[PDB]
Design a protein around this ligand. Sequence first.
Ligand SMILES: CN(CCOc1ccc(C[C@@H]2SC(=O)NC2=O)cc1)c1ccccn1
Lengths: 11, 263
Amino acid sequence: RHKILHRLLQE
Amino acid sequence: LNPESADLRALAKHLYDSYIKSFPLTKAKARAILTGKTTDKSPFVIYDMNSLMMGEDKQSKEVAIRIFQGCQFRSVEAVQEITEYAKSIPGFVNLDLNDQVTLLKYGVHEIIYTMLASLMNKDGVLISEGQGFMTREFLKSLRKPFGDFMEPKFEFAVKFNALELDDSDLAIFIAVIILSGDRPGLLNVKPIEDIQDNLLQALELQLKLNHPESSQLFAKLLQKMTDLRQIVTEHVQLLQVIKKTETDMSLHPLLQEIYKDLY
Ligand SMILES: CN(CCOc1ccc(C[C@@H]2SC(=O)NC2=O)cc1)c1ccccn1
């Protein structure tokens, strides 16, 4: 869950 | 100014600079566009289905859906900008990553509607980075359920804009919203409250220095944080209705993710 947000945060 | 005040001014400036980097269209620019005090072409006005279509020349689902999904598309880009801005708030990226996610999940729409007010007056809203101006009346005219989804946002905006904040004030306010220790499901509230404490101090000083004549602006602004939540919860309910009645539509996956188990 929150795959995208995780990605944006870790990017 | 003393040394603790100095650290608070430095934080204010650091946030202002990140805000300008993260958010392409500032309230400064928006205001210039809306008052006419700019050397750019004034924006294309969308006030009806016809003007809309001629402005589109600047999918083919019905108009209300196209508009609603354009709003979604704008939020998706806004979430990305807000995420970048959040990463610049000192101490944010040192939090538990699950808590960074939770803060963003609950913060983004409050910030979106805050910053949307910067683009609004009582008659309409700038779109497409200020290249367009869509009238409030036109948005009201859309067929149910879409006809009154913008109204609570405009009503909020006219009240909020009366505070006359600038971008330097907004940059701190937005950080305060993100660092809210009462979001559901947070794992470790203490480091979040510690950051918010500093931000709130920074905001109070900022408001005293930038608006020395506007007594208790800090207190008026804190009460709006409560009103923003109401806008979001109501919007969630409208989305539930729309999801049931318009299986034409499909929520963008970033937005599905944010809205899932939100309120
Ligand atoms: C009315 N404008 C300005 C933007 O106005 C917005 C209104 C609401 C939102 C929130 C979105 S809509 C949704 O259901 N969830 C969201 O996150 C985001 C932006 C339009 C209209 C069409 C195209 C571009 N701009």
